[PDB]
Structure 1
Amino acid sequence: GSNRSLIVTTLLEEPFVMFRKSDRTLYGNDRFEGYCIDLLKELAHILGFSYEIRLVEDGKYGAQDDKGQWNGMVKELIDHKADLAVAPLTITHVREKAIDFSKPFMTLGVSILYRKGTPIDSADDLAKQTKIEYGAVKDGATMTFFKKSKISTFEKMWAFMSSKPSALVKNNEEGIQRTLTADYALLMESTTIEYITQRNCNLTQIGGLIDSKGYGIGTPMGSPYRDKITIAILQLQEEDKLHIMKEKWWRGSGCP
């Protein structure tokens, strides 16, 4: 064991982690802002560590291939290339077999992003039909949810998605654009839907939450920092700081 700064793996995703806008050019950690950047700053202060933020090269959250090999931030942790993954990283039972998670700092569920004014009201309506395309981000928790479901409705939807080489999108930005340009609904985590629908009055959430889960800080399996981060998250919750941080970055814009 050594004393050194922690390496934090992450990726770009609004409003969690973004390149802050400046016209003096910025280096290192100073390049970044967002809810997860604030959370990291608070966790580092409480626990007393310095750190360096590195974007994950493949830009992916993490999913397993047919051989069982991981990619994205999960793989960085597995390979011990980072000490912490600080991102909107969904805690899943499958991922827990490969990495460790703090307790959640945010909770959420899968829901549906679609246009307003349609008669679609639930995931069942989407599995019912064919005119409206639907999908999710590739190599993500939401995709894995459908690929692994044993509920008929979601097995059907996975068959649909999986077979269309367009429905599984590279990231949230491309999914949002598809919703804006084609007859397409995005399966998407509810926190990000809240973020988008507060800023785009022509989009809405369709239905409620299809499941319930949390975002946690990821560590390599067995890391001593996992329980420390958990304790610090509980302190930030008790101090009201996770509340302030959410409302800081989910500020919202006027939608009549």
Structure 2
Amino acid sequence: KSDKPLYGNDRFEGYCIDLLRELSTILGFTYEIRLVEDGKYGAQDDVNGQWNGMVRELIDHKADLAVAPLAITYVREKVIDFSKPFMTLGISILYRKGVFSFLNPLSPDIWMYVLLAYLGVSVVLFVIARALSTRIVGGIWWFFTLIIISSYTANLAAFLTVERMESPIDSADDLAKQTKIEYGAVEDGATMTFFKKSKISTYDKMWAFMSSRRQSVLVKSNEEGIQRVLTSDYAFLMESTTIEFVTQRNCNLTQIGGLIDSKGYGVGTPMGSPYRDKITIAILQLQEEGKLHMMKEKWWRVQNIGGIFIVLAAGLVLSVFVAVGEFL
């Protein structure tokens, strides 16, 4: 994007544009870059069987080179051949990362009626001034505070125990058993295939939840999935190097979990494009060069107890003021 008109073989930039440039400088190839008409990475169809998108286009042999971040899938290997792996990759999951909370685990009407009872028992003690009676009253007050403070510790115990048992979701199975953050990817995904055509039953049920709500769950674009994750809990399954060059420039995001599968994007060609092998050879030559890695550099770059502390300190100041009143 810039302040003039370019087009075609000039309207693009990135790392794969540099891949086209250096692969051209190796193989002596000339090239014009054209986008995908279907606007997706494309897949073999759900019922038609034919490929979609750029996979359809190189399947139609309508364009020679396909230097995109395109996954070398074994199902995709049957539709068309590929060179050696350009950048190693894998699927990974991307998702984002008071003074009543003292009295929290007791429901507030109870703690109100507690102070009411404290005043009431104080009133009965004052009315005792018209000591066995004093003793009996003191003892019921004992039982009272005991049940209350004890049950308090029970409620704060349990409600701390559950929330310290829940968080976070830091694994693939963690996103799998949950049903809260929406989990998916962009449309026509080789990533969405590698989830969808998998046999690892966790990933299978993740495909079931995704393709279940496939209107709203799946996305259309990786940037669209980024907006869906940065806006709400539509967490995206996504590619490795994409997750890196997303996460390095969006701190509110986070790259949860490990590596789901192991893949690698690379130069794709139709079956019988003769420059495939020599292109793979010069790709190995560029991997020996390091301009792959140089390009990767150049482009792929007192929770609540504090509340009651405040409460106590406030009481302290108030009573010191009461003591000033006494001195007066």
TM-score norm. by structure 1 comes to 0.87
In structure 2, the partner of 1:44 is 24
Q: Which amino acid letter does the alignment assign opposite residue 61 of structure 1?
A: Y
CA distance in 1 between counterparts of 2:199 and 2:89 reads: 21
Q: Residue 33 of structure 1: which of 10, 13, 31 is its match?
A: 13
Question: Any stretches of 5+ residues in structure 2 without a counterpart?
Answer: 98-166, 302-328
In structure 1, the partner of 2:278 is 228
Question: Any stretches of 5+ residues in structure 1 without a counterpart?
Answer: 1-20, 252-256
In structure 2, the partner of 1:181 is 231
Q: Residue 74 of structure 1: which of 33, 44, 55 is its match?
A: 55
Q: CA deviation at 1:89?
A: 0.2
Q: Which amino acid letter does the alignment assign opposite residue 96 of structure 2?
A: R
Q: Which amino acid letter does the alignment assign opposite residue 163 of structure 1?
A: S
In structure 2, the partner of 1:126 is 175
Deviations, residues 78-103 of structure 1 (Å, cap 9, x unaligned): 11110111100000000011101000
Which gives a bigger RCO, structure 1 or 2 (Cα 8 Å, sep 6+)? 2
Equivalent positions of 1:1-256 (< 5 A) are 21-65=1-45, 66-116=47-97, 119-164=168-213, 165-251=215-301
Q: CA deviation at 1:184?
A: 2.0
CA distance in 1 between counterparts of 2:3 and 2:181 reads: 42
Q: CA deviation at 1:22?
A: 1.7
When the two structures are aligned, how many residues end up with a matched partner? 230
What SS does structure 1 have at the residue aligned with 2:4? coil
Task: Say if 2:241 and 2:300, in contact at 8 Å, map to a contact too.
Answer: no
Deviations, residues 52-87 of structure 1 (Å, cap 9, x unaligned): 111111111121221211111111111111011110
What SS does structure 2 have at the residue aligned with 1:70? coil
Q: CA deviation at 1:250?
A: 2.2
CA distance in 1 between counterparts of 2:61 and 2:231 reads: 40
TM-score norm. by structure 2 comes to 0.69
CA distance in 2 between counterparts of 1:220 and 1:81 reads: 9
Higher helix share: 2
Percent identity at matched positions? 87
CA distance in 2 between counterparts of 1:232 and 1:69 reads: 31
CA distance in 2 between counterparts of 1:250 and 1:215 reads: 14
Deviations, residues 124-165 of structure 1 (Å, cap 9, x unaligned): 011111121111111011111122111111111111000112
Provide the alpha-carbon RMSD of the alignment. 1.0
CA distance in 2 between counterparts of 1:138 and 1:123 reads: 20
